[PDB]
Amino acid sequence: FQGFTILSKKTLHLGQTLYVVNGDLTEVRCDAVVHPTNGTMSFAGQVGGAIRAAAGAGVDAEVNSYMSEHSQLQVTKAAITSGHNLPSKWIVHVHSPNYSNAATATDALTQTIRNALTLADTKSIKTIAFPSIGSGNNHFPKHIAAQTILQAISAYFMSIMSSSIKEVYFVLFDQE
Numbered sequence: 001f002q003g004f005t006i007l008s009k010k011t012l013h014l015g016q017t018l019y020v021v022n023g024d025l026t027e028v029r030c031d032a033v034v035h036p037t038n039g040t041m042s043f044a045g046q047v048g049g050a051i052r053a054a055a056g057a058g059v060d061a062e063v064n065s066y067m068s069e070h071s072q073l074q075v076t077k078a079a080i081t082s083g084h085n086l087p088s089k090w091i092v093h094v095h096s097p098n099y100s101n102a103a104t105a106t107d108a109l110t111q112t113i114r115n116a117l118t119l120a121d122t123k124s125i126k127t128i129a130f131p132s133i134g135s136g137n138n139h140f141p142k143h144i145a146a147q148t149i150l151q152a153i154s155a156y157f158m159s160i161m162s163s164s165i166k167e168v169y170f171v172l173f174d175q176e
């Protein structure tokens with residue numbers, strides 16, 4: 001349906017709808033998609049390559065301007081650029097944590113999700129789509145990533161009084 005298998009739906013604390021779906025993040029037409037990247041904001045990751053192909057060269061200039069001013073996106077932190085030719089309006093870039101330390105990696109992933117949602121909310125983003133951050137090149141076990149991200153999303157809306165965000169999509173991905 002519209003590029004995706006729709007697996008489940010849940011209502012969150014402030015009336016958000018959380019969908020778990022399976023498909024290609026870059027085919028989501030919403031306000032923002034979330035790009036798991038590193039401190040240089042490259043598109044070298046698995047998702048990142050697909051985002052860069054769908055967005056086109058325009059996205060490069062915005063990333064370059066940001067990196068020219070800031071030099072680094074710190075781990076777990078987020079930054080936003082236009083999505084250019086992507087179906088989605090914005091890209092929320094997050095410096096994805098590595099699964100170097102199972103004992104602290106889930107805390108870092110939780111914080112990454114919360115930082116992405118926080119930043120999206122300041123931009124009045126209404127719909128946002130997350131891939132399984134960390135579980136590709138950064139080696140999170142898939143089930144630990146899913147559980148941690150889904151719990152982080154629910155907890156974010158438990159922790160605030162108001163939000164512009166109305167739907168969150170968690171996008172699972174099978175293979176190329």
Ligand SMILES: Nc1ncnc2c1ncn2[C@@H]1O[C@H](COP(=O)(O)OP(=O)(O)OC[C@H]2O[C@@H](O)[C@H](O)[C@@H]2O)[C@@H](O)[C@H]1O
Pocket residue numbers: 023024025026036037038039042043044045046047048050096097131132133134135136137138139140171172173
């Ligand atoms: N088009 C896609 N849509 C949705 N999910 C996808 C897609 N393509 C791959 N995935 C899945 O997204 C998840 C994250 O994979 P990565 O893109 O490799 O992200 P991550 O594990 O967070 O590593 C970040 C990567 O970016 C680099 O700059 C950094 O050094 C690291 O290599 C994986 O489960 C992967 O199967």
